[PDB]
Design an enzyme around this catalytic site. Structure first.
Site, mmCIF file in Angstrom:
data_model
loop_
_atom_site.group_PDB
_atom_site.id
_atom_site.type_symbol
_atom_site.label_atom_id
_atom_site.label_comp_id
_atom_site.label_asym_id
_atom_site.label_seq_id
_atom_site.Cartn_x
_atom_site.Cartn_y
_atom_site.Cartn_z
ATOM 1 N N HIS F 202 102.880 -78.164 65.100
ATOM 2 C CA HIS F 202 103.583 -79.436 65.031
ATOM 3 C C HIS F 202 103.925 -79.984 63.661
ATOM 4 O O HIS F 202 104.796 -80.837 63.549
ATOM 5 C CB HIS F 202 102.841 -80.475 65.851
ATOM 6 C CG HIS F 202 102.807 -80.152 67.311
ATOM 7 N ND1 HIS F 202 102.238 -80.984 68.251
ATOM 8 C CD2 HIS F 202 103.249 -79.068 67.990
ATOM 9 C CE1 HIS F 202 102.326 -80.424 69.446
ATOM 10 N NE2 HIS F 202 102.933 -79.261 69.315
ATOM 11 N N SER F 206 109.082 -76.386 66.045
ATOM 12 C CA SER F 206 109.459 -75.028 66.419
ATOM 13 C C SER F 206 110.527 -74.420 65.530
ATOM 14 O O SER F 206 111.264 -75.117 64.838
ATOM 15 C CB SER F 206 109.970 -74.988 67.853
ATOM 16 O OG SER F 206 108.932 -75.195 68.786
ATOM 17 N N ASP F 229 110.217 -74.847 80.804
ATOM 18 C CA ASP F 229 108.965 -74.122 80.934
ATOM 19 C C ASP F 229 108.497 -74.003 82.389
ATOM 20 O O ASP F 229 107.987 -72.964 82.793
ATOM 21 C CB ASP F 229 107.890 -74.783 80.086
ATOM 22 C CG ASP F 229 108.156 -74.626 78.609
ATOM 23 O OD1 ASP F 229 107.314 -75.064 77.787
ATOM 24 O OD2 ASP F 229 109.221 -74.055 78.275
ATOM 25 N N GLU F 272 91.099 -50.641 79.118
ATOM 26 C CA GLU F 272 92.217 -51.186 79.895
ATOM 27 C C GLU F 272 93.563 -51.000 79.170
ATOM 28 O O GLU F 272 93.624 -50.946 77.928
ATOM 29 C CB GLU F 272 91.990 -52.662 80.188
ATOM 30 C CG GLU F 272 90.890 -52.936 81.180
ATOM 31 C CD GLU F 272 91.158 -52.301 82.537
ATOM 32 O OE1 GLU F 272 92.061 -52.785 83.266
ATOM 33 O OE2 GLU F 272 90.460 -51.306 82.869
#
Ligand SMILES: CCCCCCCC/C=C\CCCCCCCC(=O)OC[C@H](COP(=O)(O)OCCN)OC(=O)CCCCCCC/C=C\CCCCCCCC
Ligand SMILES: CCCCCCCC/C=C\CCCCCCCC(=O)OC[C@H](COP(=O)(O)OCCN)OC(=O)CCCCCCC/C=C\CCCCCCCC
Ligand code: HEC
Ligand code: HEM
Ligand code: HEM
Ligand SMILES: CCCCCCCCO[C@@H]1O[C@H](CO)[C@@H](O)[C@H](O)[C@H]1O
Ligand SMILES: CCCCCCCCO[C@@H]1O[C@H](CO)[C@@H](O)[C@H](O)[C@H]1O
Ligand SMILES: CCCCCCCCO[C@@H]1O[C@H](CO)[C@@H](O)[C@H](O)[C@H]1O
Ligand code: FES
Ligand code: FES
Lengths: 80, 241, 70, 147, 61, 380, 98, 48
Positions: F202, F206, F229, F272
């Site tokens: 912030h 962005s 979103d 994995e």
């Protein structure tokens, strides 16, 4: 406080209409798709290549592995 | 690496993402297990109650469990003792411990079959292939005393002697007990033992998609609807030039 | 018969063995077997061929076998 | 969607299958001899099912005990005659009474005394209430399902 | 015109919008479930216990 | 004090300045949706995780069956177990795109946001690693034994550090317990650190696809991105659920349906999927010690990205050369992943080393170099 | 103070008493006669202690050190010719030998 | 536990050998007896 101290802007007019006076998804064929295609074209030759070049390596490496598992008759031709 | 043969893909009645288990075939399978495999194979995670509403009636189930004696206790004197099973009991183990099991099967250890179709690549397709697929070893291959040749089992020398043969049992539902019928039903049963949620899980998947497709479309329209304000927005540069 | 018990398996197995790729594979196997059995100091084995065969036969069986089962 | 996922998760906390499986026990009334008391395990604690002969609904149902310590009226929360079903647990310090002995021919808790009659009521002892009477049903006489 | 009406009676007042969402949900559930269950079962005729139950449900021993 | 409560209240003010009145560029794309998903993803793991923890038992003699008993007896236990398990992959899938996006758009230039980011990744790895041992299955145990023993190669303090970690002489009960502890803990540290991540974020706001100052055109997060979103949430959530519900074990090793057994080493012990890429780089370097470092570097390399930016521009939107180089690298990671899944034999072994080499070459030499060359071609 | 509390807490993670108790095992050779192999439980895995005769120790010398997958002579292993102590685990895939 | 507290490592090894414990199973899956080790816990007097 971030809205008001962002930038010194002068002389730019913008026009927009309420979401209710306009269509959500407009000109799908006249504008939408033609651009989808446009965008798709501009990139294929940048992305696709190394991904295709990957597939090959995968296929080769796979097939070769299996090949080396197979027997070569040339080891038993003289085993009377 | 090394050579191995991979089983084919049989069209199980429950292979379809939206297709459930054929409970009739499962019910048979339970018999196959009960009357053949259960002789050496433990199925620790399933209990007689599990059958109720799936393959048998609460009554049949109560009966099937009473056919077995279990070990409870201790009593007032601290001794162990036997009693007829309840639906709350789990399928009886064939041997006290693994050591005893190996001892009665030539040092080999028949694995518990509760999750077998998920413990082996191929699940039923593999288990099915293995069962029916026994045969004589090809030239140059010798199976040591005690093992049996199966091309489907890694190493091809398996400690399990062909377990099923035509008419080795009689389906009380009147089904031609051909060896393949058996393997097929039992494999179907193993799927179920491995994951009882099978049907419910798939029924949910259906609902999930329908809602999903509906909800997505809706939120796409909403997203577009709000954004429209920007998407069509037009600007211009008007200096007092 | 008019009443005997047959496993649809063995039936469909016979039917598939008379199929092009099974035959071709079955053939190469017989040869292998033959020359491996006729020798007394070869390391060779006929697994590979046996598999190519079983793989081809069995793939075929799967396509039909369950049609005849309950 | 939300309603379902929450319902699902919420219910993931209530009793599991293996637990509901021991929730209730069904006792066959038609295999219990007269007078003789039998105990079964229900919810980890002894369950007393006694068959009253002829001198139980009489000798211990006509008893004139004016002031009681627990308002015990067989018509309040009981039912069947020759049948008495109790939770084999004393209401003093959670001990299990016995069927053989009993100053009042009923049950006797060897922990501190507590004597219970044939109907399962505290007579001589420190235990306040009377042996608890669990929920049940009779949709099939020759069979009772407690729990 | 439903859209017009809907808007007026249901979507205009936030309080009624909410009431619609709830009652709407209650009815949607009832119908979405029944429907899907229906579809799932037809897709699996004769395989579910629900289907073969009768054979042992008061028809044996 | 002030007109509307959303700004005055010591708490709403927070919720407001970061989810409602927050200045967002107008041109951010779908690639920016991963932050929120990672966040949601997290809240979801913790929820399903707790639910599973309320039925788990951390003891070699009960772990495996506690998990089994959960799927078998607990109402919707099977569903929660699945959601949690598959959720972990959805997590990594997302984090890998999140990172990618960062790399391709020079987001890393926001050093602190980026560095905390690397920390989130590392933490998530530890978390998902310990998590996987909990069901105590063949692969759980064996993987734990091979992976943790790796440190034994570290000089002098090697063995000591491992036997310490194990709480004994081999992965046994004392390990299972401390792992369950760690697994319960780390997620919460992730949440905390995510707050720091967004806090640094912030400061600058962005970044955006064109890589040029977006102050001349910012928009309130809500409804624009809150809506965007929520849409991206359902768009991904579909495949997640589709998988989790129709093909449950599509990604899991069947070897883990077999209770851990110290007297049977599985044929191919591998971690994995989301780890393979590094497992691969590990085996590329024959030399227990070098391979470890190479592993470490494979991820720690992310900390250098910011210092290897030579372009006069931020994104690659207008750098076609860098673009193929970027997609090459991606493809490269795909191959590395693949190699990790296969045995250690020809032709894999060599392809491995090749891909591992191209990996570091691209990030350490090609990228900054092609970057400089690109500047000259622009007459800079 | 800090050094201590940290040291204490840190060590609260290393092997507990019950584990160190199984750390090492002492086997009485008198229990093992020549020509017979005996196995004991050490760290959850079989421990082989065989009493080799002066005979097998010789068959051991006729071993072609360069004709093995893992090149090692009896020299590089045992400490006393009559005693061989091994970890009963196959080097292939965790099985216990016969 | 006694070692270094009330007895010597030696005395302790002895005190434990005075007892037979139940170990197993063996190759055949049977239980069996053996002389105690210092790693064993004080014998229980009753099975249950
Ligand atoms: C059987 C069911 C019975 C139970 C009833 C419970 C349901 C009660 C819900 C109360 C109704 C909500 C009231 C909304 C009023 C506020 C509002 O303005 O609408 C929302 C407002 C819309 O704005 P406008 O179109 O401009 O509205 C104009 C109004 N004249 O904001 C929205 O977009 C919200 C609606 C979209 C929701 C999107 C969520 C997508 C998520 C999907 C994942 C699945 C869920 C799983 C949950 C996880 C829990 C662990
Ligand atoms: C790491 C472990 C490896 C595991 C692999 C992860 C999964 C990989 C799946 C493949 C990715 C498929 C993505 C397809 C998208 C292709 C596409 O649209 O490309 C064109 C498009 C055009 O961009 P612009 O120049 O801004 O144009 C503006 C005009 N409107 O490019 C983009 O979308 C930008 C690229 C972002 C996506 C990157 C995702 C790849 C992720 C992999 C991880 C890589 C990073 C390093 C990780 C180290 C650990
Ligand atoms: C006489 C005991 C016996 C009977 C009866 C028997 N099995 Fe087995 N089974 C074994 C043995 C022994 C093994 C172990 C083989 C090995 O690991 O070498 C085994 C292993 C298996 C395996 C595969 C093991 C692997 O590693 O892939 C499956 C699956 C299996 N049996 C299925 C069945 C089924 C289904 C039945 C009933 C139709 C059955 N068995 C009946 C003894 C039996
Ligand atoms: C727990 C994991 C993480 C969470 C939940 C998280 C969350 C977020 C969120 C919410 C954003 C804002 C929206 C967006 O641009 O996506 C963000 C931005 C960002 N994150 Fe993360 N992040 C995580 C991991 C990482 C990692 C591993 C890195 C990289 C090493 C990273 C780098 C960044 C950067 C650089 C930005 C700036 C985006 C821009 O270019 O504008 N994040 N992250
Ligand atoms: C940071 C998010 C998380 C990740 C990435 C994660 C990942 C995992 C993984 C990969 C497993 C193994 C699943 C399997 O295949 O069986 C697992 C299991 C488990 N996790 Fe998590 N987990 C997370 C958070 C949590 C949290 C916060 C809890 C609860 C405090 C939790 C509790 C458990 C439990 C109890 C298991 C064991 C049961 C099982 O294996 O299903 N997890 N987790
Ligand atoms: C098969 O179907 C399932 O049967 C269950 C009952 O056994 C139900 O609870 C599930 O909702 C249903 O989908
Ligand atoms: C994207 C949001 C997806 C949520 C879809 C909700 C579907 C889950 O719904 C489930 O269906 C089962 C099958 O009948 C029922 O047995 C469960 O009780 C019910 O909760
Ligand atoms: C008596 O033995 C004690 O055991 C302790 C271990 O807890 C040590 O720290 C002490 O130094 C030692 O004297
Ligand atoms: S607990 Fe019964 S008399 Fe005290
Ligand atoms: S021969 Fe394979 S583990 Fe011993």
């Amino acid at each position: 406080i971030h809205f008001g101290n962002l930038a010194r802007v002068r002389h730019i007019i913008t026009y927009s209409l309420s979401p209710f006076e306009q269509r959500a998804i407009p000109n799908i064929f006249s504008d939408a798709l033609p651009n989808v295609w446009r965008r798709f074209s501009s990139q294929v030759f940048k992305v696709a290549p190394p991904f295709l070049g990957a597939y090959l390596l995968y296929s080769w490496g796979t097939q070769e592995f299996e090949r080396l598992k197979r027997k070569n008759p040339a080891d038993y031709e003289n085993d009377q | 690496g090394e050579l191995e043969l991979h089983p084919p893909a049989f069209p199980w009645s429950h292979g379809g993402p939206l297709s459930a288990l054929d409970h009739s075939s499962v019910r048979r399978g339970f018999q196959v297990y009960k009357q053949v495999c259960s002789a050496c194979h433990s199925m620790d995670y399933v209990a007689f109650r599990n059958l109720i509403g799936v393959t048998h009636t609460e009554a049949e189930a109560k009966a099937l469990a009473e056919e077995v004696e279990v070990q409870d206790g201790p009593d007032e004197n601290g001794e162990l003792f036997m009693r007829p099973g309840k639906i709350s009991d789990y399928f009886p183990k064939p041997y006290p411990n693994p050591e005893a099991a190996r001892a009665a099967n030539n040092g080999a250890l028949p694995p518990d079959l509760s999750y077998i179709v998920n413990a082996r690549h191929g699940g039923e397709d593999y288990v099915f292939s293995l069962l029916t697929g026994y045969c004589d070893p090809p030239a140059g291959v010798v199976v040591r005393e005690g093992l049996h040749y199966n091309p489907y089992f890694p190493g091809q020398a398996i400690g399990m002697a062909p377990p099923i043969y035509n008419e080795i049992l009689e389906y009380d539902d009147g089904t031609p007990a051909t060896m393949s019928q058996i393997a097929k039903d039992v494999c179907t049963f193993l799927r179920w033992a491995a994951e009882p949620e099978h049907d419910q899980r798939k029924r949910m998947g259906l609902k999930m998609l329908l809602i999903s497709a509906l909800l997505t479309s809706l939120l796409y329209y909403m997203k577009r609807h709000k954004w429209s304000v920007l998407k069509s927005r037009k600007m211009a540069y008007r200096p007092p030039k | 018969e008019e009443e005997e018990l047959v496993d649809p398996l063995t039936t469909i197995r016979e039917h598939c063995e008379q199929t092009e790729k099974c035959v071709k594979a079955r053939e190469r196997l017989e040869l292998c077997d033959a020359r491996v059995s006729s020798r007394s100091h070869t390391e060779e084995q006929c697994t590979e061929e046996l598999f190519d065969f079983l793989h081809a036969r069995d793939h075929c069986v799967a396509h039909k076998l369950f049609n005849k089962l309950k | 969607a939300a309603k379902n996922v929450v319902t699902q998760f919420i219910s993931s906390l209530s009793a599991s299958a293996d637990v509901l499986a021991l929730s209730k026990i069904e006792i066959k009334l038609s295999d219990i001899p007269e007078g003789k008391n039998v105990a079964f395990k229900w919810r980890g604690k002894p369950l007393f099912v006694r068959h009253r002969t002829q001198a139980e609904i009489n000798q211990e149902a006509e008893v004139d005990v004016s002031k009681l310590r627990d308002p015990q009226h067989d018509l309040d929360r009981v039912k069947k005659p020759e049948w008495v079903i109790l939770v084999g647990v004393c209401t003093h310090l959670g001990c299990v009474p016995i069927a053989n002995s009993g100053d009042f021919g009923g049950y006797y808790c060897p922990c501190h005394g507590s004597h219970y009659d044939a109907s399962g009521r505290i007579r001589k002892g420190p235990a306040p209430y009377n042996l608890e009477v669990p929920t049940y049903q009779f949709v099939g006489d020759d069979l009772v399902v407690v729990g | 015109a439903l859209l017009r009406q809907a808007y007026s009676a249901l979507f205009r007042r936030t309080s009624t919008f909410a009431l619609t969402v709830v009652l709407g949900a209650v009815l949607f559930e009832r119908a979405f479930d029944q429907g899907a269950d229906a579809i799932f079962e037809h897709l699996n005729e004769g395989k579910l216990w629900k289907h073969i139950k009768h054979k042992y449900e008061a028809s044996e021993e | 004090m002030a007109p509307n409560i959303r700004k005055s209240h010591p708490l709403l003010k927070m919720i407001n300045n970061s989810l409602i009145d927050l200045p967002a560029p107008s041109n951010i794309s779908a690639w920016w949706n991963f932050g929120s998903l990672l966040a949601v993803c997290l809240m979801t793991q913790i929820l399903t995780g707790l639910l599973l923890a309320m039925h788990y038992t951390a003891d070699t003699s009960l772990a495996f069956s506690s998990v089994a008993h959960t799927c078998r007896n607990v109402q919707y236990g099977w569903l929660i177990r699945n959601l949690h398990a598959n959720g972990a992959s959805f997590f990594f899938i997302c984090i890998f795109l999140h990172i990618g996006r960062g790399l391709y758009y020079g987001s890393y230039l926001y050093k602190e946001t980026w560095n905390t980011g690397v920390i989130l990744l590392l933490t998530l790895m530890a978390t998902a690693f310990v998590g996987y041992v909990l069901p105590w299955g063949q692969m759980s145990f064996w993987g734990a034994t091979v992976i943790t023993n790796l440190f034994s190669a570290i000089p002098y303090i090697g063995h000591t550090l491992v036997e310490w970690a194990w709480g004994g002489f081999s992965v046994d009960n004392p390990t299972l317990t401390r792992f369950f502890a760690l697994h319960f803990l780390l997620p919460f540290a992730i949440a905390g650190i995510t707050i720091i991540h967004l806090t640094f974020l912030h400061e600058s706001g962005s970044n955006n696809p064109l890589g040029i100052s977006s102050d001349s055109d910012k928009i309130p997060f809500h409804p624009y991105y809150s809506f965007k979103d929520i849409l991206g949430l359902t768009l991904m959530l579909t495949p997640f659920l589709t998988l989790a519900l129709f093909s449950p074990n599509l990604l899991g090793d069947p070897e883990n349906f077999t209770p851990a057994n110290p007297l049977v080493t599985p044929p191919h012990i591998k971690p994995e999927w989301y780890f393979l890429f590094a497992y691969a780089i590990l085996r590329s370097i024959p030399n227990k010690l070098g391979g470890v470092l190479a592993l470490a570097a494979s991820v720690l390399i992310l900390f250098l990205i910011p210092f290897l930016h030579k372009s006069k521009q931020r994104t690659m939107t207008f750098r076609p050369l860098s673009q193929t180089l970027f997609w090459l690298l991606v493809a490269n990671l795909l191959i590395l992943t693949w190699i990790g899944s296969q045995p250690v034999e020809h032709p894999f072994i060599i392809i491995g080393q090749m891909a591992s080499l191209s990996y570091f070459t691209i990030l350490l030499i090609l990228f900054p170099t092609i970057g400089t060359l690109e500047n000259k071609m622009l007459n800079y």
